[PDB]
Amino acid sequence: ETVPVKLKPGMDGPKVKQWPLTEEKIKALVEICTEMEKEGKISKIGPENPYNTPVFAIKSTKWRKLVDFRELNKRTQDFWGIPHPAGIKKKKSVTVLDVGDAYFSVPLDEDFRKYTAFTIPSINNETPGIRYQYNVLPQGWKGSPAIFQSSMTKILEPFRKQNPDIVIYQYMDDLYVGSDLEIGQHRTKIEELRQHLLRWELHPDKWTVQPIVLPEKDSWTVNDIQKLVGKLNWASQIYPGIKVRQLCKLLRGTKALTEVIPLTEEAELELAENREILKEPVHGVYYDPSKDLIAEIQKQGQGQWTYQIYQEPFKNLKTGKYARMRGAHTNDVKQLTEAVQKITTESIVIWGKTPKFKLPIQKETWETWWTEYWQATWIPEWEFVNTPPLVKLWYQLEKEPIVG
Amino acid sequence: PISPIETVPVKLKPGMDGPKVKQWPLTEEKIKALVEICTEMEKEGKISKIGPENPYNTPVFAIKTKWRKLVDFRELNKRTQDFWEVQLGIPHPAGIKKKKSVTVLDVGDAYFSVPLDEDFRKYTAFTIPSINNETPGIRYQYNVLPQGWKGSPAIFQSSMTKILEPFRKQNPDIVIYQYMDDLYVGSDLEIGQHRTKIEELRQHLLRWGLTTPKKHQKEPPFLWMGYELHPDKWTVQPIVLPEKDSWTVNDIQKLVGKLNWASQIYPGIKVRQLCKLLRGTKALTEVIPLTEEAELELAENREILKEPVHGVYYDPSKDLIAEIQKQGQGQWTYQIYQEPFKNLKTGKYARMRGAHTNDVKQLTEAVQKITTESIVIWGKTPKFKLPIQKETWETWWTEYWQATWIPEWEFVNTPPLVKLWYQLEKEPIVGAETFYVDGAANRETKLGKAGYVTNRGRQKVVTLTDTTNQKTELQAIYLALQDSGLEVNIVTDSQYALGIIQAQPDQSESELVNQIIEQLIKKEKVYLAWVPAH
Ligand SMILES: CC(C)c1c(Cc2ccccc2)n(COCc2ccccc2)c(=O)[nH]c1=O
Known part of the structure; x- marks a missing residue:
């Protein structure tokens, strides 16, 4: 019927x-x-x-x-x-299944x-x-998926029970399965589900909203402070507690950009107070189901890409970075897509919906090739933009591993 | 003789x-x-x-x-x-696979x-x-x-299609092009075999009531939207520019129109002087005397057009190549060929008078329209032959704020070449003067002032009557470049300058920006620094 x-x-x-x-x-x-x-x-x-x-x-x-x-x-x-099973997001490892065939x-x-x-x-x-x-x-x-619902649960229970330690999330043509088993024991529990289905590697908890870290230096030059002071300004939009008076005060005068300046104890404290504020994400940011989820990406260069998911400006539900993959060395479009897809799967995993993307690329350029490297069963929404210089300078300033 | 069709x-x-x-x-x-x-x-x-x-x-x-x-x-x-949408x-001739023989079939009152x-x-x-x-x-x-x-049209089309599925499956080495009231049937068979498959086709068509007509029987070359379809090549149908000792506005517009369309197929057709005649016009019938210069250029065109260009058909087993040249700032010419000198297609991209771009960018945009164009025509992307050093390309793209890319290509030295006319320094220039620019303008009174103060005590302030806020900001910058040496450090609080940095444009709409670019291009080293205002 x-x-x-x-x-x-x-x-x-x-x-x-x-x-x-x-x-x-x-x-x-x-x-x-x-x-x-x-x-x-x-x-x-x-x-x-x-x-x-x-x-x-x-x-x-x-x-x-x-x-x-x-x-x-x-x-x-x-x-x-x-x-959305708020639990699928907290699982050592998650693997996705293409079940579009089901329909x-x-x-x-x-x-x-x-x-x-x-x-x-x-x-x-x-x-x-x-x-x-x-x-x-x-x-x-x-x-x-919606119509093939009654029938999906059915074919599902048995493994849900045989293994209630694992959680299953279905989005469109996809099945996100999460557990905590060791790799072999996990990947092996999957195929157990596979075959189960045939008869009819994400690590979520590793994600995190990385922090911003200001540069620290032996000596500071005019230019340097101007840059720092520039980035802080922007950042104040996110952290109102950030203040740059004692810093701009070191720039009182028309001296060479290259000249070196000794920070005052005042300016020094001021920095210290700011590093602390930036030690953690801005308080009060919670997800609102009734609102659209947005994702902005910036081309940091050298295969580097920064993104931020949010629904309200400066109130990020998460922030990240993405380095190009071995082989994409001469292809932006390729990185961007992967990026998008990656940010999209992450998004789904956390809130069960795809975000609207603001892509730093020209419509024509994108629409031509994106299909050439796309690989998900779904397709997010997108619009094309002109990245604000600072938004980039700001997030470029994120923190990476001590070594890796 | 109707039809037993559903x-x-x-x-x-x-x-x-x-x-x-x-x-x-x-x-x-x-x-x-x-x-x-x-x-x-x-x-x-x-x-x-x-x-x-x-x-x-x-x-x-x-x-x-x-x-x-x-x-x-x-x-x-x-x-x-x-x-x-009925096939709309x-x-394009360049995308047609040549066939030994082609037959046109009139399915006129098939409607x-x-x-x-x-x-x-x-x-x-x-x-x-x-x-x-x-x-x-x-x-x-x-x-x-x-x-x-x-x-x-749509229904007729559909039907014809239903009706042809059989015959096509049967003889796949035979290509049929349903265009309007015509069926172009072509193949690689022997003229005799061909003639017979056509006749078979014909009979299969009558078998469905599509009475196909010798008096009307079409013959080569075949006419197709300004294209003549000969067996070895296609050609641009004669384009004519009517001479008169009198020309109304409309006449100069229509002309310009036609002349404009020719720029594509025909190299250097120009209209700058004809277009120059439409200034301050009051009525389409109005008569404008053609200047000497326009008389001179309208002449040369008549000569460029009196030199018809042909083109080759498509050979799937051969390479798709596209060479691109820069015929002026933000203006480009391209030609797509398989064998050297036998073009499938050529074209030219007018000057997008943008707010601020750079050649590597525009070059990049040209490559795209082309690629899309090809995908459409041949369903493939060409091998690009571009007038840009692989280094320049790497250097630019590797830093630009916007995702971009060029498919497989190669450098070719057919000047002029596209380049980065300047590159803002990555760090302040040591021992170079540092100008602190600023500009203010009462948006209401359009009365402003713009100036600077350098580390070396040099200063200046110019007054500006009938200006806006940006005009002064960017002006403050122009002066600094003007009065400085071959290397400057320039700090500004203009969010607009912040743009010039991220994009490092080499062409714009505003003469002001344009000027700045000129000074920029000239200096040996320039370091732009933005800093919040107030
Ligand atoms: C669509 C088919 C039928 C076709 C054609 C016609 C054709 C192509 C485009 C638009 C209208 C008609 N030609 C055009 O060549 C014209 C020609 C061929 C042979 C002898 C004289 C002229 C060709 O070279 N190969 C083809 O496969």
Whole structure:
């Protein structure tokens, strides 16, 4: 059977245009689609269907079909899934499972399929697009997990019981499984779940809101103080207790930037008082479910990226840094994506929802290649920005390991 | 000769009702003619005499040499549901794989060859008048896709496609391009084999009622939006600039238009002087005398255009290469070829008059439009041949505040080259003067002052009538650069300067910034330092 899935009130279907795809990618989707077509998951559609959703392929030599239901999902009626087990976040190790395959079984309300229309492009437009719509639950649509709920718990209990020491969290096509076992004993308990499923490595507690550390020096020059004093100023927006009078007082006059200055005991105390304030995160920052969760990333350079998740300005729910991965040496876009995906999985793990990203990159640039390195079953929301010079100088100033 | 095809389920927009527009009155000469045609079409099975109670109607017209019908569905159309965008992204010669042979097939009145959702027909009702607003005229409605109806093109297209799936599967080494009322069928078979597969195709088409016509039979080259399609290469159709001893505004605009489109395919076409003539114009018909200079440039173009450029077709087994050149600040030229000198495509990117950019950036943006363009055309990315030292590239990108990237490329020395016109020092310059700039302006009175004080006691303050807050800040900076030596340290509290730092632009909109850049570019070493104000 199938449950009547309607759109939210007064909402029409998605009409997102398919951005260009590489030949390779196209040849795959055709294969992946002809197949599914036969197996009855999807059916060719006519022109009387005006809706459309972007789709593409990701990476074995096999390709996955990734459909972008962001817009449909936004317009799909709400279902008030599974609440966030505040425990999944506190677990020595978490592994994720792709269970999107699950939905291929269940049929989809025929009156709603139209809205699932998507299109495979043709190189140079030498052919019409190949239109399809779904007959079953689509991987990527929030309605899928929700509808495949009753049936997921079912297949789930047994392992939940066989192991109540482990916690399971399902988000969209994903299954986040958490435990504390030793590696072998953990990874081995997973496959036990795998096979269980087949018949039908994150370390959360290691994360933390790293602190800011001001530079310390034998000798300080005008310039130096100006920089320190500059960064502190900005920081006062987060910590009102930070004060720079006795510091700006060392800059009273028009001397060379290079000249060295002896700090007063006053200025020295002043610094000490600030280091302390920065010793911990600003008090009072708590998460609010009813509000959007935001994520801002900055290109610190040298493969370095700083991000901050927050819902209100200067009230971070977490802050971090990310160094490029071996091999991305000449590719920003690659780092950013990985970054995004990583910040997104983290986000999900803690609050069960993807954040809205403010990406320091040009739309065009991003939209072209992002698909080339993307690897998650879901897709976050994003907007493109122009990073404020200080916001970067500020977080660049974070703390790293003594050695590593 | 209609079609045994399954109709498409067409609905009217949300709620809206069928058209109820009043039938424009016509003369006996015209009425008698429309009756003629409709009786003919009535026979063919195309339309239907229908009875009353079809509140819907559309105004039929008769035009000319023999009388031709012409129903106006504008309303039916604005009330008709939306369909998927009929192919609105047309190919490009450069992306076509050459084939030994190509045949064009005319599936003209195939529109009338396709059935209409019998359930929707009722809306297509219209009426042939009597001699005066006399008695009730003759009433009909379409049983097939009507010419001029919102969904005909789409549906026809779809159908044609359904209909061709068999034949395509059967003979895959045969490419069919459905474009409008034409089927371009090309292959690598022997002219005889070809001719026969075409004839087979033809027959398979009639098998579905798509009566395909020799008098009309198209032949090469084939005309396609300014392109001539020859077997070995395509070419740009003749572009003409009409001469006159008189030119109105409109004329100079249209021209400029056409000339502008040519800049792409044709190298250095220019319009600076023609465009120069549109200044202070008062009416499109107004007559502007062409200066000497414009007369001189309008001349050269006529000569550039009188030199038609051809292009090659696409060979999948060969490399995709793209060379990019800088034809002026923020202006670029590019050409994509497989074999040296046999271009598939060329083009040029106008000068985005931005608020503040740098060449490495703009170069970067050019590469992107191109890449996207190629993906679309060939479904691949080219190998780039760019006029920028791998070091300059590494040096810039490695520090820029914004994510960026260039696909696989290579350096090529075809000047001018793109470079970083200056690089702010990473640290204060020792033994170099340090200017402390500041600027103030009463945003209201636009009365301001801007100046500096150096470590060496040098000072200055200039007054500014009709200025703004930023204009002084940046001014304070200009002066400092002006009055300083080849190496300066400049400290400012201008958040705007903070921008110039992170971006180190080398071109802008404001002459002021522009000036600063000039001084910047000149100095051997400059260190910019921002510091909070107040
Ligand atoms: C779409 C197909 C049919 C096709 C064509 C036509 C064609 C291509 C683009 C737009 C309209 C028609 N040509 C264009 O070549 C023209 C030509 C070929 C052979 C003899 C004379 C002219 C080609 O070289 N290869 C092809 O596969």
